[PDB]
Amino acid sequence: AGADEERAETARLSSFIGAIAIGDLVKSTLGPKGMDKILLSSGRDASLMVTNDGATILKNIGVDNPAAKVLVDMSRVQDDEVGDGTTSVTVLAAELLREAESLIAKKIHPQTIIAGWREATKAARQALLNSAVDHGSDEVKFRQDLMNIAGTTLSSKLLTHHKDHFTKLAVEAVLRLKGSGNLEAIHVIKKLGGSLADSYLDEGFLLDKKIGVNQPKRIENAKILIANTGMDTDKIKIFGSRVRVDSTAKVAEIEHAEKEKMKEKVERILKHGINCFINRQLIYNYPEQLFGAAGVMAIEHADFVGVERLALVTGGEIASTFDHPELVKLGSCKLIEEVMIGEDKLIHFSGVALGEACTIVLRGATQQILDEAERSLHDALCVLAQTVKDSRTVYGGGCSEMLMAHAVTQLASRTPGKEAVAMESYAKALRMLPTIIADNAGYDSADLVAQLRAAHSEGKTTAGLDMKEGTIGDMSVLGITESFQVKRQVLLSAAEAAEVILRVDNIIKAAPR
Amino acid sequence: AGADEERAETARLSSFIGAIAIGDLVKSTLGPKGMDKILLSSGRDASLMVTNDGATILKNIGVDNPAAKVLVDMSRVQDDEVGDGTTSVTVLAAELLREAESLIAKKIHPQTIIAGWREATKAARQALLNSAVDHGSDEVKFRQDLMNIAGTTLSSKLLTHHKDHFTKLAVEAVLRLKGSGNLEAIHVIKKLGGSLADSYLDEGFLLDKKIGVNQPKRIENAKILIANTGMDTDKIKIFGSRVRVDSTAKVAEIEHAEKEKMKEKVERILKHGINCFINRQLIYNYPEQLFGAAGVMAIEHADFVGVERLALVTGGEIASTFDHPELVKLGSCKLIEEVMIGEDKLIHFSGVALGEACTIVLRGATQQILDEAERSLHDALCVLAQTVKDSRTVYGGGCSEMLMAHAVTQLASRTPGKEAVAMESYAKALRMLPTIIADNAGYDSADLVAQLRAAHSEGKTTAGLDMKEGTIGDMSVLGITESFQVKRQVLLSAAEAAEVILRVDNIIKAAPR
C-alpha cells in the first residue's frame, strides 16, 4: 500500500505472469489420469505434500508479491457453492490474458475490449440449457447414488486402487444429511490401523478424549450431561479477599466449602443414572475421584465444535449452572464406548435416535500414501452434497468444452469491428482444454483435436475425450460428470475476474470472506 | 526574508500550473463513461481511497505548496445547494488560465482585460433562460421519481450495467426520508452472493452482532428490548464505600445479591415472551446464561446510531433501568432472525408497522467495485433530495455546453478588437467539454467535434453527445439530466475564483517568522 504504481504494459504483465504460472501446473491435474506434484519448502513444513486438489495447495500458501492470492481465495467460495469437480475454472480465466499480446498491436483503449465480457454473459447463458444433460436424482436412490462423479473426482487421484471403494461410501453420508437444516454436523477422522475397507461408517460421533487412568471400562443406557460453566470454583467478582484466619482452624471451613460443590454434583448425578459427562473447558480435580466410584465417564476440555454437533444428535440440552441435570438435559441412550481400533484408543458415541448427523472413520496400511485419505476425503464430502441441491449436471471429460467452442467461433464474425477480434480470442481459449487432456494420455495431441471437434459438432453431448482410448468416446458409460453450477459459475466468475485486472492499477489487501 | 518570491512570468505561472494539474485527473471522471481513481499517500491516510466524486478528493488533501486548496473549498458550498451529479465546474475554471499566455502579447493592465469576467456574467445569463429544462418533479411522483439524474451520476461510474437498476431503487428511499424528519435513519451494506436484482429492500434494520455461539436460532412474534444502561452492577449513587468486612463469612451474602439482578430480569422476561434484547454497551455475564435457556436473543455493545433509528421504526421506548420491559416499551412483532443469505451471516430486523425508516442491503460479485456501490448509493441519497427541492434542471451528456458555446462565438466579434480577444478566450473554454466526453468513450475525438456543433446550432436543446453510439444522439431518450443550480453557481463562482489570482500582480512574499 506504500506505492509500486504500475500502468498499462507493465501492470498488465504482473497479472499476465500470475495467470500463466498457475495455468500450467493446474493443467496436469485434470481428467481421470491426473499427475501428482511434490512440493518442497522450508520452515514449519517438514516434507513433500502430494496434493492433486487444484484448490488445497493454492489455499495453503501465499508465496509471493504478485496479485493472484485473492483470485485463488475465491475458488473456495465456489467449493462452498458447488465444489471442486475437477479443477478447470482457474485455467479458463488465465487463458483470455494470452491474446492481450495481440491487443498491443491493436493499440487503442484496452477498456473498450472489456465490452466482450458483456457478450460473455450471453455466452454463459447460451451454454446454459443447451447442453442437454442428465436427469433423475430422484432422492436416496438405489444404484445411481454413486459409482459415478465421486469416482471421477478420485480418478485423477493416486488412492483410486483402494479409495474408489470408500469414495462410494460418501453418498450414503449425503442421503442421511438431506432434509431441512442446511449443511451441518459432518465430521471425519483418520486412523492408522489397516483393513480391506479403509473406512467405517459411524452411526454416531467420534471424539478422542479420556477422563483419566481410573473409571469404569464401559457404560450402558448412557445419559449425556453438557455444562457451559466449568467445574472450577473460587475467585468470582468481589472476591471476599485473600485470606488469613485467626486460628488456621477456620481455614478448614474453606476446605469444607469445596466439599459442598462435590456433594451437589454426586447427589443428583446418581438419580439420573449418569453414564457420561461432557464439559467444554477445564475440569476441577475433586469431582474426578467421585466419577470413578459412581461409574461415570467424564471428558476434560472437550472441544466445543464436537459438542454442538453432538447436541443436535442427542436431542440437545439446556446448558446452565449445576441445576442442568435431569429434565433440563436431554440424553440419548444407545451406546457410548471407548473402543480400541487396531491400535490408537478413541471414544465412540453411537445409536443416535435423530439420524440427522453422522461420523466417518478411515483405516489403512500406514505410509505417506495412506495419509492421502485425509486429502481425498475432504474432497468427497463437498462433491456429493452439491449434486443433490443443484439437481443438474454436465458431461465431463471435455465434452462440455468442445461444443461451446463450435458455437463461439460463429459469434466473432457476427459482432461489430473491434468487438469481433476480442470475442474470437475468447472462443479459441476453449480449444486448449481438449489438447491438455489428450497430451497427458500418452497419445499424440494433434490427432485428438480434429477428431474431437467433429463429434461435438454432430450433436452428441455424451461423446467426449477418452484418454485410455486415445480417441473420442462415450463419456456417460465412463461415469465422468460435472455439476451443473460448476460450469454455470465458472463462466460468470472467469469473466468478472479477468476484467478487474486491466481496470485496477493499485492492488494489495483488506475485506470480506 | 528567505520566503519564495516570484515576478511577472513565474508568479502567474504558479497559479497556471495548479489549474492544469487538476484538469487531467478530473477529465476521466466526467460523463457516462468515467474512470475510477485511487490515490495513495503515506501517513495519516491508512488505506486507499478511491473517489469517483471529484469534490471529495480535492478537499481531503493539500499535497503541496502551490495554491489551489482555496479554489477547491468553494465546491462544497455548491454541494450543500446541489453539488454532485457529475463534476464539471472545476474543469472549466482551470482552462480559462491557458489563454492568459496570449495576454503577455499585451503587457500593462490585465484589469481592463478583466472586463471579460463581467462579460462572463453576460454568458451566465444566456445559459439561464435558454434551452427548455424540465418542470415538475413535484413530490413523491410515480414514474418521474428516477431513471433520470441518479442514473447519470452513476453513468460516470463503471458499475452501471446492473447498477443503474440500484440507482432507481434509491428514489424510493428518499421518498420515505423527505419530510420534517430531516436526514436520519439511512444505513446501507453490500453482501456476498450472485443475483440479477443485486439488491434487497429491508423495511427494518440490518445489524451484525451475535449473543454468543449458544441461543435459539430463530425468534418469532419477537419482542424488542433496548437499554441505555448496562447490565453491569457494583457502583450505585451511594457507594457503601471501600469494602472490608469483619471475617470471610459475610462476603457470601454479596454474591447472592448478584442473583437478585439475574432473577429480576427473568421474572419480567418470561411473561412478555421477549425474543430479543439490544444493549448499547458492555453486557454482564450472569444475564447471558439466562437468555439462552429462555429462548431469547441478545445483542452486546450494539452501536447507538443503529438503536435510535430502530426506536422510531418499532414504536419507541423509554429505555430506563430494568423497570423498562412491558407497556413503557413498544415492540414491533413481525420477524427477527439470523439469516445466512449467502455465505455470510447477519441479523435481520423486519416487518415494521410504522413504515417510515428503512434499511437497504445490496448483493454483488464478491470484490472491490461492489464497495464502489457503497460509495455511489450514499452519494445517491443527496442527489434526489436536491433535485426535488431545486425544481430546476438542464440536459446532460454535454448538451448544455455546446449550445452555450454557439452563442458565445458571436459575442467575441460583437465587441471591439481588444475586448474581442479576451471575450473569445472564455468562449473556447466550452469547446473542450464536448471533446472530453467523447474521448473516454473509445471513439476518435476529432470526428465528434464537427458533427456536434452542427446539431446544437440548429436549435435542438435535447440533442447531445452519445458515447454509446460513437456519434451524437437524443439525450432525452436516455433520460440524462443535470441539476440546474450546478450551472448557475459554476459560472458565477468561476469568474471571481480565477479573477483574484489575476487581479493581484507580482505576488511578493517576505519577512515572516
CSV table of C-alpha atoms in Angstrom, one decimal, chain A residues 166 169-174 176 186-188 197-206 348-351 355 357-363:
chain,number,residue,atom,x,y,z
A,166,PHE,CA,-14.6,-45.6,0.1
A,169,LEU,CA,-19.4,-44.6,0.9
A,170,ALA,CA,-19.6,-40.8,0.8
A,171,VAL,CA,-23.1,-40.8,-0.9
A,172,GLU,CA,-24.5,-42.8,1.9
A,173,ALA,CA,-23.4,-39.9,4.1
A,174,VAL,CA,-25.2,-37.3,1.9
A,176,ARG,CA,-28.9,-39.0,5.7
A,186,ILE,CA,-20.4,-33.7,9.4
A,187,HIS,CA,-17.1,-34.9,10.9
A,188,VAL,CA,-14.5,-37.4,9.7
A,197,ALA,CA,-12.4,-51.3,3.7
A,198,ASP,CA,-10.3,-48.4,4.6
A,199,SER,CA,-13.3,-46.8,6.2
A,200,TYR,CA,-16.1,-47.4,8.8
A,201,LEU,CA,-19.3,-45.6,8.9
A,202,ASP,CA,-20.3,-44.5,12.4
A,203,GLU,CA,-23.9,-44.2,13.4
A,204,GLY,CA,-22.8,-41.6,15.9
A,205,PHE,CA,-20.0,-39.0,16.6
A,206,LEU,CA,-16.2,-39.6,17.0
A,348,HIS,CA,-17.3,-43.7,20.1
A,349,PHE,CA,-20.7,-42.1,20.6
A,350,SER,CA,-23.4,-44.1,18.6
A,351,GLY,CA,-27.0,-45.1,18.1
A,355,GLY,CA,-30.2,-39.8,12.5
A,357,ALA,CA,-25.9,-36.2,11.7
A,358,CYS,CA,-23.2,-39.0,11.3
A,359,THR,CA,-19.4,-39.5,11.5
A,360,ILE,CA,-16.9,-41.4,9.1
A,361,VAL,CA,-13.7,-43.2,10.2
A,362,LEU,CA,-10.7,-44.1,7.9
A,363,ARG,CA,-8.2,-47.1,8.1
